[PDB]
Design an enzyme around this catalytic site. Sequence first.
Site, PDB file in Angstrom:
ATOM      1  N   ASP A   1      -6.533  -5.025  -5.199  1.00 53.03           N
ATOM      2  CA  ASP A   1      -6.976  -3.543  -4.308  1.00 53.03           C
ATOM      3  C   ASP A   1      -5.467  -3.675  -3.430  1.00 53.03           C
ATOM      4  O   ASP A   1      -5.155  -4.038  -2.460  1.00 53.03           O
ATOM      5  CB  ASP A   1      -7.901  -3.787  -3.458  1.00 53.03           C
TER       6      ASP A   1
ATOM      7  N   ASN B   1       0.663  -0.851  -0.022  1.00 55.83           N
ATOM      8  CA  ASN B   1      -0.218   0.299   0.285  1.00 55.83           C
ATOM      9  C   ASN B   1       1.294   1.312  -0.215  1.00 55.83           C
ATOM     10  O   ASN B   1       1.831   1.197   0.790  1.00 55.83           O
ATOM     11  CB  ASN B   1      -0.755  -0.110   0.940  1.00 55.83           C
TER      12      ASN B   1
ATOM     13  N   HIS C   1      -8.878   7.153  -4.296  1.00 55.24           N
ATOM     14  CA  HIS C   1      -8.707   5.276  -3.771  1.00 55.24           C
ATOM     15  C   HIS C   1      -8.371   4.320  -5.705  1.00 55.24           C
ATOM     16  O   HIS C   1     -10.074   4.168  -6.080  1.00 55.24           O
ATOM     17  CB  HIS C   1      -9.630   4.173  -3.352  1.00 55.24           C
TER      18      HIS C   1
ATOM     19  N   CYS D   1      -0.487   6.266  -6.838  1.00 56.96           N
ATOM     20  CA  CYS D   1      -1.853   6.662  -7.182  1.00 56.96           C
ATOM     21  C   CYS D   1      -1.913   5.266  -8.203  1.00 56.96           C
ATOM     22  O   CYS D   1      -2.529   4.294  -8.230  1.00 56.96           O
ATOM     23  CB  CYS D   1      -1.954   7.738  -8.134  1.00 56.96           C
TER      24      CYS D   1
END
EC number: 3.4.19.12
Length: 337
Positions: A275, A12, A258, A17
């Site tokens: 994700d 993460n 996100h 971006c």
Amino acid sequence: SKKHTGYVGLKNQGATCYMNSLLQTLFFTNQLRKAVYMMPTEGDDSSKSVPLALQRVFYELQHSDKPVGTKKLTKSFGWETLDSFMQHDVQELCRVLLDNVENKMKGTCVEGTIPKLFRGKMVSYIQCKEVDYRSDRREDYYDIQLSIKGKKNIFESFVDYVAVEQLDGDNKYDAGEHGLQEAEKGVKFLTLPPVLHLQLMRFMYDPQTDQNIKINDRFEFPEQLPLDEFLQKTDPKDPANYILHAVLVHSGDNHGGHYVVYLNPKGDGKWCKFDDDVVSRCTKEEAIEHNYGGTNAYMLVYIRESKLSEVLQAVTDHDIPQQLVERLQEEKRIEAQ
Ligand SMILES: Nc1cc(-c2cc(Cl)cc3c2O[C@@H](C(=O)N2CCNCC2)C3)ccn1
């Protein structure tokens, strides 16, 4: 997590971006991945080599159980800050990555892989109505930017992309010695690549309002995309039918938000939601239908039906040269000690 879907996430990083979405997309373009492993990176420096940095990420995404870091890769092409990603598009980042690779692959067994996978051809013409003058320019393209404002779907976007513009009234064509002339302007596709990168223009500068607006409109894209009708000359032996491979999605606020990518890695209709560090299985409808919007898809990757088996050819640990493996493990030994 790797044990669930067999695929591994990226760490993460809010600053990066849309990089993790792009890296995963490019990683599951298997023919590029194999190609990337064969780059002669022996001589290149550990810190400031983009081709080596892409090899590291790709190697790690193939082998690691834990999520993969991208800090060395960000440092290699100098986009450390958030502002770097904010003042560039996803296609521009892809150009930066693929140029470094394309240049390293010159003078090798893997030369011309980037243009083989991504480079199509188009003609832009300007034809005068009442005078005999034409201006053809042939252009290569590695990606297509599609218009979506007042467009229901991709078919309508391609209709608009090839639609003939009328240069007349105040916007007459300056035809040199002939002067101001009424004319027709247009674009025609000569070829379409095996891997088709389509960016959806969700940021048009508005002339009337005089401000850059985001577009949150519903825009439908299909699992299968036929594109023969948009080519100037169709091939009976190889039609331009495409299969949906990736969907790069953005949600929430602009200038942070996100970023997620949805992928169909084997081209077999079995979708996974990537994700960042969390990779999980999902439905076709979650990947395709639920990202129509009106949460918005901004880039789509289609692969040509005829080229699918070659493009998504099976990678194994043996397809990475031992010299590269020895190097990358020797880094991993020192970092852990
Ligand atoms: N082609 C493209 C579009 C986006 C994008 C798409 C959506 Cl729907 C919303 C956002 C996006 O990026 C943020 C932004 O506004 N940016 C200012 C312009 N450059 C990019 C970053 C928020 C990101 C990367 N590539």
